[PDB]
Amino acid sequence: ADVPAGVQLADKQTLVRNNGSEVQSLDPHKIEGVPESNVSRDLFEGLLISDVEGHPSPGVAEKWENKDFKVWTFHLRENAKWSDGTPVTAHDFVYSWQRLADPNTASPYASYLQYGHIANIDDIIAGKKPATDLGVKALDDHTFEVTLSEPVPYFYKLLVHPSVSPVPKSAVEKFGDKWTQPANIVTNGAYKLKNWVVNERIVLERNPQYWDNAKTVINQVTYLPISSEVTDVNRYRSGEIDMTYNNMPIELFQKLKKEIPNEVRVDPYLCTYYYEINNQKAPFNDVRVRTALKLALDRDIIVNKVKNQGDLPAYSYTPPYTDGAKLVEPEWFKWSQQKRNEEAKKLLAEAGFTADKPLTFDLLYNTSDLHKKLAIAVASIWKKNLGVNVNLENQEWKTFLDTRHQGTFDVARAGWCADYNEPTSFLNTMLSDSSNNTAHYKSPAFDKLIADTLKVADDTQRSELYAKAEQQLDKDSAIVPVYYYVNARLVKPWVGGYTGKDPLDNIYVKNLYIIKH
């Protein structure tokens, strides 16, 4: 943390953050969500980290070079250490990236190594080559070299993500899936795990071995698993919580803007809220059904009437303000809602649906007052506008993600937030073989458009190709875009170091500080 001259620090440097839900895991290779990544950034540090404004910056790697954007060489700082005092080496990164690639690990982020195009990843994921053939090597203890199969100019931007953080081989091998228990875990970020009580709290304490420990200010941070946004706000206002999770309750938000304006932080965020359709399950394998659902949802009602927290109605998957996004707003988005409704009804009528045999299906969402209220509104809108019946189902976060991966669903609420600020951070998740493809969408045409983006060596052709890839997804109605999120949360006046300038919201508790109050 960089405490401004003149600021008086509180005697007790502790923080309590709400984290939305119980985490899937603390193992960097078994996680895929925001709550998971929030804790992961305090515990495991990769090659690069985001600074306080979100810029990719030195993590374990103090400096790096690239040759033709294909061979990346990272020079690891000599004093990088794990919490048990042992050095973090390039060998840790080699083991870690191989474990991520290995199909036996079954990481939801196995495809992150395909997104960066590390050599031999496709064959490794497919079981054709052993994970040890991955294009990574330790040239020495302090030098990690990555070899890609094609030039990727934005490659280093990927490296702040939890999936490419190092994990400690000896703990993994000795304790297997209990390696992340407090008595066994070993970490290399600014914090160490002190306590983990499922559905109660995660307590982290400062890691004295961290290389940049002298600049850490907060001594302990607690992450809570509260999925009710109302309850989060209540425990924030009671004094327990210093920073709410960044999901805000429809019940109270308008009142909060008037009551504590200075604490209501609202900043740009590269995330899209959408209804994920299971594209491989009848009748959602019919483009007419998906298109009907996409058109009949009234975003103006949802975004401006129901939620009204500053979100913008969405017509694409990639947020339009992602760096490199130059998207074409589809003609249906300019139509009137009535015109969208007629087209929708026409398509469903063409798909075989009638008043006597209507379309009925489930709408799965992770427990939350916000998603429940939005799903109830969407259900009402779809019933009224298109004559469809939906059965709402809530599931806790970890179960909910497993259901979407399993494909044991019809339509699910969804939100994707960028991992690096570039259109492929979104677009790569709709690749037929992506480990992040919970839409179960498989388009050879879409796949080809993205493969072509690194076959050209310039940004304008690349941006036009991303635009076309979005048009292909839209043409297929793979999803139902709802809104682009804003990052809205409450932060007490005494929490310093949180700018709100990072559109990825990659917060590190090592950058924060408690102002005397």
Site residues, U ion (CB under 5 A):
11, 153, 323, 362, 369, 410
- The CA-atom distances, in angstroms, between 243 and each of 1, 237, 420, 433, 517 are 17, 10, 24, 37, 16
Asked if 16 contacts 221 with a C-beta cutoff of 8 angstroms, the reply is yes
C-alpha–C-alpha distance, residues 100 and 49, integer Å: 19
**H/E element, 65:** strand 61-67
CB-based closest residue to U ion: 11
Q: Smallest distance, Å, CB 187 to U ion?
A: 29
Task: Report how far residue 246's alpha carbon sits from residue 181's, in angstroms, rounded to the nearest whole number.
Answer: 27
12 or 334: whose CB is closer to U ion?
Answer: 12
Nearer to U ion, 138 or 392 (CB): 392
Count of beta carbons in the 10 Å neighbourhood of residue 62 = 16
Name the residue nearer to U ion (CB basis): 45 or 369. 369
State in angstroms the smallest separation of the CB of 382 from U ion: 15
Dihedral angle sign, alpha carbons of residues 231, 232, 235, 240: positive
| Tokens coding 481 | 């875009």
From the CB of 432, what's the least distance to U ion, in Å? 24
Q: Which two tokens stand for residue 339?
A: 């015109």
Give the DSSP letter of residue 491: B
Q: Residue 43's CB: how many other CB atoms inside 10 A?
A: 24
The tokens for 341 are: 């409704």
Nearest residue (CB) to U ion, 27 versus 229: 229
CA distances from 134 to 47, 75, 94, 170, 506 (A): 17, 19, 9, 21, 28
Q: Which is nearer to U ion, 11 or 331 (CB)?
A: 11
**Which of residues 11 and 68 has its CB atom nearest to U ion in the complex?**
11
Minimal distance, residue 184 CB to U ion, in Å: 35
User: C-beta of 363: minimal distance to U ion in Å?
Assistant: 10
Q: How far apart are CA 89 and CA 13, in angstroms?
A: 31
Supply 412's token pair.
């699910």
Q: Residue 153 or residue 283: which is nearer to U ion going by CB?
A: 153
Collapse the DSSP code of 503 into the 3-class scheme (helix H, G, I; strand E, B; otherwise coil) and give the result.
coil
Nearest Cα residue to 423 out of 384, 443, 447, 450:
450
Closer CB to U ion, 331 or 458, in the complex: 458
In the complex, minimum distance from the CB of residue 191 to U ion, in angstroms, rounded to a whole number: 23
Nearer to U ion, 11 or 356 (CB): 11
Backbone angles phi, psi at 101, to 5 degrees: -70, -30
DSSP letters, 179-224, are TTSTTT----SSEEEEEEETTTEEEEEE-TTSTTGGG---SEEEEE
Distance of closest approach, residue 517 Cβ to U ion, in angstroms: 6
Tell me the C-alpha distance between 432 and 422, whole Å: 19
State the minimum distance, in angstroms, from the CB of residue 283 to U ion. Answer: 10
C-beta closer to U ion: residue 340 or 462: 462
Instruction: Supply the minimum distance, in Å, between the C-beta of residue 157 and U ion.
Output: 9
Q: How far is the CB of 178 from U ion (least distance, A)?
A: 36
CA distance 22 to 83: 24
